[PDB]
Write a protein that binds this ligand. Structure first.
Ligand SMILES: [Fe+3]
Ligand SMILES: [Fe+3]
Lengths: 320, 147, 49, 544, 102, 218, 229
C-alpha cells in the first residue's frame, strides 16, 4: 500500500464462485476433502462505454542479479491499444524494438553518448534521387504529387556561340504622395495614381542619385544628375544604363526543340526537350519525347498529370 | 483454377452502348456481379430478377448513405441514380487480388468482403464508362491459381 | 504530359481525363521521377528543394 | 464547360502555356498533312509547301529568294510566334534619395570586433530614421564633393576588409567541401573568383543595387549578378515566363532591391530581390510560399530542419483527448531502479545469513562480487525456464557500491529481533513498510507535486491565452482530422470494419477460443460468482 | 553550427548571480530530485528550472544531439517542448511553471 | 546597440489635427508612449545580437515564435504599430475610398457602407486594448478586416496591413473619456488617410497580384 | 436585475490623490455600462436570478461584463479613504510566512501590476483550490499547502475562475489613472500601495476564505464518514 496511487487502464477483480452446481451433490473422496467455496483473481482492463476494450497484457520475468541471487519477480505490463502517446509526459519509459540495442538516439544515454556517436557515424540512405523537388500545380489543389528532376533528366547543351549596392532609400516626409514607390508600372499606375500630376510629358522626376552624409547634407558631383557613388572605393562612377549591349538570343526560354532541328551548321540541338535554363554561354534542356497524335484520338490524361511507364497515353482507332 | 478476385469484363449490347460488368469471385465460387446500363444504373446481378439496388446493398452493409457518397469518387453519378458467408469467403489470395486491382489498404489478414471493397468496385465500374479503366483478361495466368 | 496547341482544353465527358484533339499535334512527356508524397512530407518537401 | 473557361482553368491551375514547338521539316509535314486524310492528293497550301520543303534544295531556293542568309534562316525557325507584347518603358516616381548605412547583421557569428567601434558603426541605424522632404531635394544639393561625412561607413569598410582578408580561404574551403558543383546562387570559386568581390555580410535587405542578368531558369526564376560571390535571385515561376521572356533577357542591366538575405548553407539562394527597374510585377501571379532550402545528408531530424528553415511543424493526427481534463501523473522514473536495488540489497543480505562463514571476514560496507561486472553485459533475454508462460527474462546486475549494506544489515537485525520477540509473544510479527519504500513514495509524491503545479499553471495559461485570443495548440502540428483518406483503422466510418451481417465468423481474426479454453482449464465450472469485487476493494475490506 | 538552444528557443542563463537568484523567488520554488533515469516530458507551459546539484543533458525528440546544462544554469523550457531528460547522478532542481507573462 | 531609436515624426504637424484631436493628446501619445517603447526596444536589442540584426517585420515574426511571444515581441510590435498609426492619418478629411481601393472594397465587401458598418462593428466589439486592421491576404488575394488583441499585428500571419487604428485607451481617453463609438466615427469620417492606404496597396501589388492573367487563344 | 452599488466612501471628497471628476467618470460609466449590458444580456434567461459569481463561473458573452462589474465593485470596496500604510493581524503572519516580509509583498505587487502590458487587474489571492482531474487529493496533507499568491490577470479575467479566493485588487486599466494624472503607472501603483489600500477588508476576506476552506475540509470528512457508514 502506498499513500499516492496513480490510475491505469488495467484493472483487477476477485471472483468467487461455487465449485459444484446447486441441487446436485458430487461424490466426496475420503482422502481429499471437498472445497465448498473457492475464490479466484482476474485481470481485466478498463473498457469504455462507447468502445469495449480487450486487455492485452503479457508477463515477463525480471531478475535482479546480486552476487548470484535471482529475484523471481515477473512483472506484468499491459500494452495499451494506443500506438502513440498523447503527450511525452505520459509516454512510456521505453519505446523501442530492442531495449538492449542503442542505435536509437533516445536509447542512447546522455552521459555516455558513444551509442549516439556510433549512430551519427552511419551514413545517410540513398533513397533521395539527388535531384530538385518539382511540385505539380495541377495536383496542388488535390492530393499533391512530386516530380524529381536530376542530372539524368536535364542536360547542358554547351557553348552555343558599377554593379554594387548603390545605397538604401530614406523615409519620405510627404508620405501621402507616391514617393515610397520607387517606380511605376505601365499597367498598374492608372489604378493608384491619378494621372493629372503626370499628364505633362515627363512630369515625374527622372532617375537622380542624391547622396546624404551622416550630417544630413545632400551631395552629388553633378547637382541634379545620375552620377553614382561606389560603396567600397567611395569613388563616383556611371552605371551605363544603355550598357552598349547588342546580343541576339537564338533560343528562348521554354521552347520545345525537336531532334535534327540544327540551330546552326555546327551543332544541332537534341533531347527533344524544353529549355528550362538559359545562361550566357550554355542552355539546359529537360529531356522529353514527342508523340504524334491524329484527329479523333483520345488523350488519357490532363495537362499536369504524371504518367508512369506502361501507362496508356493515346488510343488510335485504325480501320481494318 | 481461376483465382478469386474482381474481374471487370465488358459486353457490347445489340443496340446502344456497351454494357460493363464486374464479377467478384470467391473461394467457394460465389459470383457477386455488378452491371451498368446506358445510365448509371449500378445494378447487381445476384438476384435472378431484372436488377438490384447497389445503394440498398450498401445501406444493408452498414453505410449511412452519407459516408458512402463522401468516400466514393465521382459521387455525383452515385447520388444522381434514384449465401452471405460463401460470397464473402474470400481467400487470402482473393484478398490480395482485390487489393491489387482496386487500390485498397486492407490488411492481408482481414479476408472478408468488406463494403469498402464493394464501394470501390462500384467506383471503378462507373469509371469504366468514362474510359478510365482497363478490362481484365481472364486467360492471364496471374488470374489463375494452381492446386 | 504537355500539349501546346490543337488539343481541346475540356474533357470529352463530364468526368474523366479523356481529351479530344481537333487537329494533328504532338504530346510531350517531360521526363522525371514521380514520387508519392504524404501530408506529413509536403510540409518539409516543397518546390525547388 | 466552354473551351475558353477550360483553357483559363488550365493556365491558372495546371500551368498550361502555348510554348513554341520547333519542329523538323518531316514533323511539320506530318502535322500539316494528317489533317486532310490518308492517301489523298494534298490540296491545302501549307501541306504542299511542307511537302516541297521536305527537300533541301527547295529550302535553299526559298532562302535565296527571300534574300536572308543561312544563319538568318536558322534563327527564323527559333522565332517567338503569336501576339508580341509592347516594349515596357521605365517610369520613376521621383527623386531617389539614398544613404550608405552599415548592415544590421555586420558582426559575423564567431568573429570578434571592437565594441567602441561597433557602437560608432551602429549609430547610423538611429540616424536612418530621419525624414527628408523629397520635393525640395534639388534646392539643397551641393555639387562640392570631398566634404561628405561617411566616417562610420569607412570604419565599417575597414573592419569588413579585415574579416574578408581573414576568412576568404576558409569560406572557399567550406564551399568546396559542402558544395560539389557551381550553380546560380552559390559561391563563385576557382577561376570565377576575381578579387574585389563583395561578401554576403556586405549586403542587407533594403539596399538598392544594380546588376546584370546572368541566368534565366524556368521554374526557379531569374538570377542577377550584383558584384559578389553569390548572385541574386528574383522569384519567377513556370507560367509567367511565357510573357516575362519578352522583358527579361540575359545580358540586360537592371536595378534590383534586396528583400531578404539568408544563409547559403540552409538556403539555395541566399539573397532574394525584386526588379525595380523593369517593374514586371503586373506580370507575376505564381508566388513561392516558402524559400528554397537544402536537404543535406547531415540533416537527420526533420523537426530541426523545419525550425532552421522557418517552415511549419510536421503535421500530426489530432488526438481527441483534452490535455486540461486528464488524470495526473504520479509514477516516478527512479522508482524502478530504487525497487531493483531494494530487491538486490534484500537478496544479498538474506544470502549473507545463509552463509555466515562467507559474511564473516568481509565488511558489509565494502564488498565485491565481481571485478569486471558491467551493467551492459547484465542486460539479456532468456526464455529457457517456463513454468506456465515463456518470455525473455531481463537480468539486472546491481553495482556493489550501489548497495549500502550497513543500513540493510541493521534493519534486518532489528526486524529479526522483533520477529523472535513477537514469536515469544505468540503472534506473527508484521512490519508496514521499509525505508527505501518510503523513499520511493516520497519520490512519487514530489513527482505528483510537480505534475499538479504544471497543471495548475496550465489552467491559468489556458485562460490567459483564450482571453487574449492566443492559440492553445502549436499551429501546424495537429492539422488533418480526416483529410488524409484511404487510412485503414477499422473504425467502420470508411467501412473498413467487418460487415455487420451477424459477424459470426471469428476464427480468421480476433478468435476468443484460447481465452475460453484456458479459463475452462483453470475453472471448469463457470458458475454464477457469489462474490465479485475489485482487488482494491477486497484489500480495503481486509484492512477495514 | 547554431546551438540547439537557439533552434528550440531554449533560453539558459549560466552562472547566475546571487541578486538574480534573489529575484523571481527562486528560494521559494518547489524542489525536485532524481538519481539515474530517463524522464520523457512534454511541456504544456513554460517552466523555469534552477538546477542546484546534478547535471542534465536533454535531447530533442528525434534528434541525435543533446543540450547540456550545469549546476550554475537557469534553464527555461519553452511551451510544446517534447524532449527526453537523462541523469547519471544525484540531481536536485527548483522548478516553477509560469503562464503567459511572469 | 541602439537601433530603431528614432521616434518617427508624423507626416503632419502635431497641431495639424487640432479641431478633432488636441495637440496634447498627440503630444502625449507620441512623446510619451512612443518614446517609452523604442527606448526599451533598443535596450532589449543591445543584449541579443541575433535579434539585433533583423528587419522590423522579420524581428516581429521571429519574436512571435508561432504563438509563444518572446519578451521582445511586445515592444517592437508596439513601436511599429504606433508608427503605422501615425502614418495612416492625414491632415485632411477622408470620406471616400480611392479608385484602386474602391474596386477591391466593392469586390469583397460589396459596398463602402457595408465596409464602414463592419469596421465600426468590429471596432466597438473588441473589448479592452488592441488594434483593428484592413489587410490584403496573400493566400486568398482578398481584402478583409482583422481585430488583434494588445500588441499583435497582422505581419505575423503574412498579411499586408493597409490601415490601422489604436484601440488602446491611452489614445482616446483624454479627448473622449468613454465614447469609443464617437472616437471611431470621427476616425472614419474626418481622420483617415485613404491615399496612404492606396499607396500601401500599390506597394503590396508587387507581392500579391490582384488581377487576371492574359490567356493566349491557342 | 442587479443595480450599481455606491462606494463606501463619499465619491466627491474621498481621496485628494484621486480626482472626483475622475472618480465620477470612472465609476459611473463603467459600473453602469456593465450592469445594464449585463442586465440586458441576462434578461429572459436561466442565468437571471443568480449571483455574479454563479454567472462568472458559468459564463460566453455574459462573462466579460459580469466579471468587470464584480471586479470593479470589489475594487471599490477594497479601499477606504484612510488607514493605509501597513497591514496587521493574521495578514502579517501569512505575509512573512510565504513572502518573507511586507516590503517584499509590496514590491511583488508593484512588479506584477507594472508588467501587465495592457488591460488587466492585479490580485493577491489565498490559494485554496480543489482539482477535478485525476489524483487531485494530496497524501500527507499539512500546512503551507494553502498559500498567498500574487497573480496577474488579463482583461475581464478574475481569479475566481480558477477556484482561487480574491483578497486584494488593483485595477491596472488606463481609465483608473490615465484620466486622473499624467499616465505614469508606477505613480498610481505606488500611491495605491501607499495611501488607499485598506487592510481591514483584506483581513475580513481572509477570515471568510479560511472559513470556506474549513467548510470544504469538513465536507470531505463528512463524505468520508458516509463512505465508512
Ligand atoms: Fe497607442
Ligand atoms: Fe476600472
Amino acid at each position: 500500500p502506498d499513500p499516492l496511487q496513480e490510475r491505469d487502464n488495467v484493472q483487477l477483480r476477485i471472483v468467487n464462485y461455487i465449485l459444484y452446481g446447486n441441487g446436485k451433490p458430487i461424490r466426496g473422496i475420503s482422502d481429499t476433502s471437498i472445497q465448498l467455496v473457492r475464490t479466484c483473481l482476474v485481470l481485466n482492463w478498463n473498457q469504455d462505454k462507447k468502445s469495449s476494450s480487450c486487455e492485452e497484457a503479457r508477463a515477463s520475468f525480471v531478475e535482479i542479479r546480486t552476487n548470484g541471487l535471482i529475484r523471481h519477480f515477473l512483472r506484468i505490463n499491459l500494452v495499451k491499444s494506443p500506438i502513440s502517446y498523447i503527450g511525452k509526459r505520459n509516454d512510456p519509459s521505453g519505446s523501442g524494438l530492442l531495449s538492449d540495442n542503442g542505435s536509437d538516439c533516445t536509447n542512447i544515454n546522455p552521459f555516455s553518448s558513444i551509442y549516439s556517436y556510433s549512430k551519427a557515424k552511419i551514413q545517410q540512405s540513398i533513397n533521395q534521387p539527388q535531384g530538385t523537388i518539382h511540385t505539380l500545380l495541377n495536383r496542388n489543389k488535390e492530393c499533391q504529387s512530386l516530380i524529381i528532376l536530376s542530372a539524368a533528366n536535364c542536360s547542358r547543351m554547351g557553348p552555343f556561340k558599377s554593379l554594387g549596392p548603390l545605397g538604401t532609400s530614406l523615409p519620405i516626409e510627404n508620405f501621402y504622395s507616391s514617393y515610397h514607390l520607387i517606380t511605376h508600372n505601365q499597367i498598374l499606375v492608372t489604378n493608384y495614381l491619378q494621372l493629372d500630376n503626370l499628364k505633362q510629358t515627363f512630369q515625374v522626376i527622372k532617375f537622380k542619385y542624391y547622396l546624404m552624409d551622416e550630417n544630413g547634407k545632400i551631395f552629388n558631383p553633378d547637382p541634379c544628375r545620375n552620377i553614382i557613388l561606389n560603396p567600397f572605393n567611395l569613388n563616383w562612377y556611371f552605371l551605363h544604363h544603355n550598357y552598349c549591349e547588342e546580343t541576339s538570343k537564338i533560343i528562348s526560354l521554354g521552347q520545345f526543340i525537336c531532334e535534327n532541328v540544327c540551330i546552326a551548321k555546327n551543332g544541332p540541338p537534341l533531347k527533344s526537350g524544353q529549355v528550362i535554363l538559359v545562361q550566357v554561354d550554355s542552355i539546359v534542356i529537360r529531356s522529353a519525347k514527342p508523340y504524334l497524335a491524329t484527329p479523333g484520338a483520345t488523350v488519357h490524361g490532363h495537362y499536369g498529370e504524371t504518367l508512369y511507364e506502361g501507362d496508356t497515353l493515346v488510343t488510335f482507332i485504325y480501320e481494318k | 483454377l481461376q483465382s478469386p478476385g474482381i474481374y471487370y469484363r465488358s459486353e457490347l449490347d445489340h443496340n446502344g452502348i456497351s454494357v460493363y460488368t464486374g464479377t467478384i469471385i470467391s473461394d467457394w465460387g460465389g459470383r457477386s456481379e455488378l452491371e451498368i446500363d446506358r445510365k448509371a444504373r449500378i445494378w447487381a446481378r445476384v438476384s435472378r430478377k431484372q436488377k438490384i439496388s447497389i445503394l440498398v446493398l450498401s445501406s444493408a452493409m452498414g453505410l449511412n448513405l452519407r459516408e458512402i457518397l463522401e468516400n466514393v469518387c465521382y459521387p455525383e453519378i452515385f447520388l444522381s441514380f434514384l449465401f452471405f458467408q460463401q460470397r464473402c469467403e474470400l481467400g487470402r489470395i482473393g484478398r490480395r487480388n482485390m487489393n491489387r486491382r482496386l487500390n485498397l489498404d486492407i490488411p492481408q489478414n482481414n479476408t472478408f468482403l468488406l463494403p469498402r471493397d464493394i464501394l470501390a468496385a462500384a467506383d471503378h465500374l462507373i469509371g469504366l464508362k468514362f474510359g478510365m479503366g482497363a478490362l481484365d483478361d481472364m486467360n492471364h495466368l496471374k488470374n489463375k491459381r494452381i492446386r | 504530359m504537355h500539349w501546346s496547341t490543337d488539343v481541346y482544353h475540356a474533357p470529352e465527358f463530364t468526368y474523366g481525363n479523356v481529351h479530344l484533339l481537333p487537329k494533328t499535334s504532338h504530346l510531350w512527356i517531360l521526363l522525371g521521377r514521380p514520387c508519392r508524397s504524404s501530408l506529413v512530407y509536403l510540409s518539409i518537401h516543397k518546390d525547388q528543394d | 464547360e466552354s473551351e475558353e473557361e477550360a483553357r483559363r482553368k488550365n493556365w491558372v491551375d495546371r500551368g498550361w502555356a502555348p510554348w513554341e514547338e520547333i519542329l523538323s521539316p518531316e514533323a511539320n509535314f506530318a502535322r500539316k498533312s494528317l489533317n486532310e486524310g490518308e492517301e489523298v492528293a494534298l490540296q491545302s497550301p501549307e501541306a504542299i509547301e511542307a511537302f516541297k520543303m521536305l527537300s533541301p534544295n527547295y529550302r535553299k531556293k526559298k532562302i535565296s529568294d527571300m534574300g536572308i542568309t543561312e544563319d538568318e534562316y536558322y534563327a527564323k525557325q527559333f522565332e517567338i510566334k503569336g501576339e508580341i507584347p509592347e516594349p515596357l518603358s521605365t517610369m520613376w516616381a521621383g527623386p531617389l534619395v539614398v544613404r550608405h548605412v552599415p548592415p544590421r547583421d555586420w558582426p559575423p557569428r564567431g568573429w570578434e570586433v571592437d565594441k567602441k567601434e561597433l557602437e560608432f558603426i551602429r549609430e547610423t541605424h538611429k540616424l536612418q530614421s530621419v525624414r527628408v522632404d523629397y520635393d525640395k531635394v534639388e534646392e539643397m544639393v551641393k555639387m562640392e564633393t570631398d566634404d561628405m561625412g561617411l566616417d562610420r561607413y569607412k570604419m565599417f569598410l575597414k573592419q569588413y576588409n579585415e574579416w574578408v582578408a581573414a576568412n576568404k580561404d576558409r569560406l572557399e574551403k567550406e564551399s568546396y567541401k559542402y558544395d560539389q558543383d557551381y550553380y546560380p546562387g552559390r559561391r563563385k570559386r576557382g577561376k570565377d573568383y576575381q578579387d574585389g568581390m563583395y561578401e554576403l555580410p556586405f549586403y542587407y535587405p533594403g539596399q538598392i543595387c544594380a546588376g546584370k542578368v546572368t541566368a534565366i531558369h524556368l521554374y526557379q526564376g531569374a538570377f542577377v549578378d550584383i558584384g559578389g560571390v553569390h548572385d541574386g535571385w528574383v522569384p519567377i515561376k513556370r507560367n509567367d515566363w511565357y510573357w516575362i521572356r519578352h522583358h527579361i533577357k540575359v545580358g540586360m542591366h537592371v536595378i534590383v532591391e534586396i528583400l531578404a538575405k539568408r544563409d547559403p548553407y540552409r538556403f539555395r539562394f541566399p539573397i532574394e530581390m525584386r526588379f525595380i527597374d523593369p517593374n514586371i510585377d503586373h506580370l507575376i501571379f505564381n508566388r513561392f510560399d516558402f524559400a528554397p532550402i537544402f536537404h543535406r545528408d547531415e540533416d537527420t531530424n526533420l523537426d530541426e530542419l523545419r525550425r532552421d528553415c522557418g517552415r511549419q511543424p510536421l503535421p500530426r493526427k489530432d488526438p481527441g483527448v483534452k490535455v486540461e481534463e486528464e488524470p495526473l501523473l504520479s509514477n516516478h522514473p527512479y522508482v524502478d531502479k530504487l525497487w531493483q536495488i531494494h530487491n538486490a540489497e534484500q537478496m544479498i543480505l538474506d544470502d549473507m545469513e545463509a552463509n555466515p562463514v562467507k559474511y564473516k571476514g568481509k565488511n558489509l560496507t565494502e564488498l565485491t562480487d565481481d571485478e569486471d561486472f558491467d551493467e551492459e553485459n547484465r542486460i539479456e533475454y532468456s526464455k529457457a525456464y517456463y513454468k506456465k508462460a515463456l518470455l525473455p527474462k531481463m537480468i539486472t546486475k546491481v553495482s556493489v557500491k550501489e548497495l549500502d549494506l550497513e543500513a540493510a544489515f541493521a534493519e534486518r537485525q532489528h526486524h529479526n529481533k522483533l520477529r523472535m520477540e513477537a514469536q515469544e509473544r505468540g503472534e506473527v510479527y508484521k512490519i508496514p513498510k521499509l525505508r527505501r519504500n518510503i523513499e520511493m513514495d516520497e519520490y512519487d509524491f514530489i513527482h505528483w507535486r510537480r505534475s499538479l503545479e504544471e497543471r495548475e499553471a496550465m489552467l491559468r495559461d489556458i485562460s490567459c491565452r483564450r482571453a487574449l485570443g492566443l492559440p492553445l495548440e502549436e499551429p501546424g502540428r495537429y492539422v488533418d482530422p480526416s483529410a488524409f483518406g484511404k487510412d485503414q483503422y477499422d473504425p467502420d466510418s470508411p467501412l473498413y470494419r467487418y460487415d455487420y451481417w451477424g459477424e459470426p465468423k471469428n476464427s480468421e481474426k480476433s478468435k476468443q477460443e484460447r481465452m475460453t479454453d484456458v479459463h475452462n482449464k483453470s475453472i471448469v465450472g463457470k458458475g454464477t460468482v457469489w462474490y465479485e469485487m475489485a482487488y482494491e476493494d477486497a484489500v480495503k475490506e481486509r484492512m477495514q | 553550427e547554431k546551438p540547439l538552444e537557439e533552434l528550440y528557443n531554449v533560453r539558459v542563463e549560466r552562472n547566475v548571480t546571487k541578486d538574480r537568484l534573489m529575484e523571481l523567488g527562486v528560494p521559494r520554488w518547489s524542489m525536485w530530485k532524481t538519481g539515474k533515469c530517463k524522464l520523457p516530458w512534454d511541456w504544456h507551459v513554460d517552466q523555469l528550472v534552477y538546477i542546484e546539484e546534478g547535471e542534465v543533458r536533454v535531447v530533442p525528440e528525434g534528434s541525435q544531439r543533446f543540450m547540456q546544462f550545469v549546476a550554475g544554469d537557469l534553464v527555461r523550457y519553452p511551451k510544446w517542448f517534447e524532449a527526453d531528460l537523462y541523469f547519471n547522478d544525484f540531481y536536485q532542481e527548483r522548478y516553477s511553471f509560469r503562464a503567459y507573462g511572469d | 546597440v541602439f537601433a530603431y531609436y528614432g521616434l518617427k515624426t508624423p507626416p503632419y504637424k502635431l497641431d495639424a489635427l487640432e479641431p478633432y484631436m488636441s495637440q496634447k493628446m498627440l503630444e502625449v501619445h507620441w512623446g510619451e508612449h512612443h518614446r517609452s517603447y523604442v527606448e526599451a526596444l533598443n535596450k532589449q536589442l543591445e543584449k541579443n545580437d541575433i535579434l539585433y540584426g533583423c528587419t522590423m517585420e522579420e524581428l516581429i515574426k521571429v519574436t512571435y515564435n508561432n504563438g509563444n511571444p518572446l519578451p521582445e515581441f511586445s515592444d517592437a510590435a508596439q513601436v511599429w504599430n504606433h508608427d503605422f498609426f501615425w502614418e495612416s492619418m492625414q491632415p485632411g478629411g477622408g470620406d471616400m475610398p480611392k479608385l484602386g481601393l474602391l474596386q477591391q472594397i466593392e469586390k469583397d465587401f460589396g459596398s463602402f457602407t457595408n465596409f464602414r458598418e463592419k469596421f465600426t462593428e468590429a471596432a466597438l466589439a473588441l473589448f479592452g486594448s488592441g488594434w483593428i486592421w484592413l489587410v490584403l491576404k496573400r493566400e486568398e488575394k482578398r481584402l478583409a478586416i482583422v481585430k488583434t488583441s494588445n500588441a499583435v499585428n497582422p505581419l505575423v500571419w503574412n498579411d499586408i496591413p493597409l490601415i490601422g487604428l489604436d484601440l488602446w485607451e491611452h489614445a482616446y481617453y483624454l479627448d473622449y473619456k468613454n465614447d469609443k463609438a464617437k472616437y471611431v466615427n470621427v476616425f472614419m469620417n474626418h481622420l483617415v488617410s485613404w491615399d496612404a492606404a492606396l499607396g500601401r496597396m500599390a506597394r503590396a501589388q508587387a507581392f500579391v497580384n490582384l488581377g487576371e492573367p492574359k490567356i493566349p487563344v491557342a | 436585475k442587479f443595480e450599481l452599488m455606491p462606494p463606501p466612501y463619499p465619491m466627491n471628497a474621498l481621496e485628494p490623490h484621486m480626482s472626483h471628476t475622475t472618480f465620477e467618470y470612472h465609476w459611473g460609466k463603467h459600473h453602469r455600462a456593465y450592469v445594464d449590458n449585463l442586465n440586458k444580456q441576462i434578461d429572459g434567461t436561466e442565468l437571471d436570478g443568480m449571483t455574479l459569481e454563479d454567472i462568472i463561473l458559468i459564463t460566453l458573452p455574459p462573462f466579460n461584463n459580469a466579471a468587470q462589474a464584480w471586479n470593479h465593485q470589489f475594487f471599490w470596496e477594497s479601499m477606504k479613504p484612510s488607514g493605509g500604510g501597513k497591514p496587521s493581524g493574521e495578514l502579517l503572519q501569512l505575509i512573512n510566512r510565504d513572502f518573507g516580509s511586507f516590503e517584499a509583498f509590496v514590491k511583488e505587487f508593484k512588479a506584477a501590476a507594472a508588467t501587465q502590458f495592457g488591460s488587466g487587474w492585479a490580485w493577491l489571492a489565498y490559494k485554496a483550490n480543489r482539482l477535478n482531474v485525476g489524483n487531485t487529493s494530496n497524501p500527507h496533507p499539512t500546512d503551507e499547502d494553502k498559500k498567498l499568491v500574487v497573480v496577474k490577470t488579463p482583461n475581464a479575467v478574475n481569479p475566481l475562475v480558477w477556484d482561487y479566493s480574491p483578497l486584494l485588487t488593483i485595477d491596472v486599466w488606463e481609465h483608473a489613472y490615465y484620466l486622473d494624472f499624467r499616465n505614469r503607472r508606477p505613480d498610481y501603483i505606488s500611491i495605491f500601495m501607499e495611501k488607499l489600500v485598506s487592510w481591514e477588508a483584506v483581513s475580513s476576506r481572509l477570515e471568510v476564505a479560511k472559513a470556506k476552506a474549513a467548510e470544504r475540509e469538513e465536507e470531505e470528512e463528512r463524505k468520508k464518514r458516509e463512505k465508512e457508514e
